[PDB]
Amino acid sequence: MNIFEMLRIDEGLRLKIYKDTEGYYTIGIGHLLTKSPSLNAAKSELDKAIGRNTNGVITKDEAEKLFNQDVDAAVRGILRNAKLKPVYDSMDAVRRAALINMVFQMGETGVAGFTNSLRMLQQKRWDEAAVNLAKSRWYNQTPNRAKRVITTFRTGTWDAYK
Ligand SMILES: [Cl-]
Ligand SMILES: [Cl-]
């Protein structure tokens, strides 16, 4: 298992525009198109992202390519962030993957606000962090995915994914 496979599981793969759990226009592997309500705006954003006239549909390859860009961007978001980097720098490989997941789902800024959980992770207070991470909208809205990530922070293994 690795970050790719791990998110591929959390997000799924869809080749037609779709609405996410919050009702936003998305495509591929959890690639957010726009927060606008307009299906056109989404179509527009999509052809711009793909470089061609898509008409709301894309191929696997295309999907996969947005997916690489997206993971890359997430990582780099993390390294550029004064609140995240250290956390990330302190952890092992598996747990790092967990952090990136959060970041992919919710943005660097969203994640940078889990101050206290971040302090805990950094200190390696596993169980405590996992409790704290659960007192979040995030857990309450997407609880099964959130349990998966959480456990991953707790155990440093991929069990939740096997
Ligand atoms: Cl893009
Ligand atoms: Cl979920």
What CATH number has the domain bearing residue 83? 1.10.530.40
Query: Is 40 annotated as ligand-binding?
Result: no
Residues whose beta carbons lie less than 5 angstroms from ion ligand 2: 142, 144-145
Interruptions in the chain after residues (C–N over 2.5 Å):
none
Alpha-carbon span 154 to 131, nearest angstrom: 10
Alpha-carbon span 42 to 36, nearest angstrom: 7
Give resolution in angstroms: 2.0
Technique of determination = X-ray
Active site residue 108: no
Q: Which ligand is nearest to the CA of 12?
A: 2
Q: Which ligand is nearest to the CA of 46?
A: 1
Per the structure, the count of domains in the chain is 1
Are 59 and 37 a contacting pair, CB within 8 Å? no
Active site residue 5: no
Query: Is 153 annotated as ligand-binding?
Result: no
Consecutive H or E run containing 10: helix 3-11
In the reported structure, the alpha carbon of residue 17 is separated from the centroid of ligand 1 by a whole-number distance in angstroms of 15
CA neighbours closer than 13 Å in the CB half-sphere of residue 134: 13
Q: Where are the beta strands (DSSP E) in the chain?
A: 14-19, 25-28, 31-34
Q: CA 115, 117, 123 angle in degrees (round to 5)?
A: 105
Catalytic residue among 5, 10, 11, 62: 11
SS3 content of the chain, % helix, strand, coil (to 5): 65, 10, 25
**Which residue range forms the structural domain that includes residue 3?**
1-162
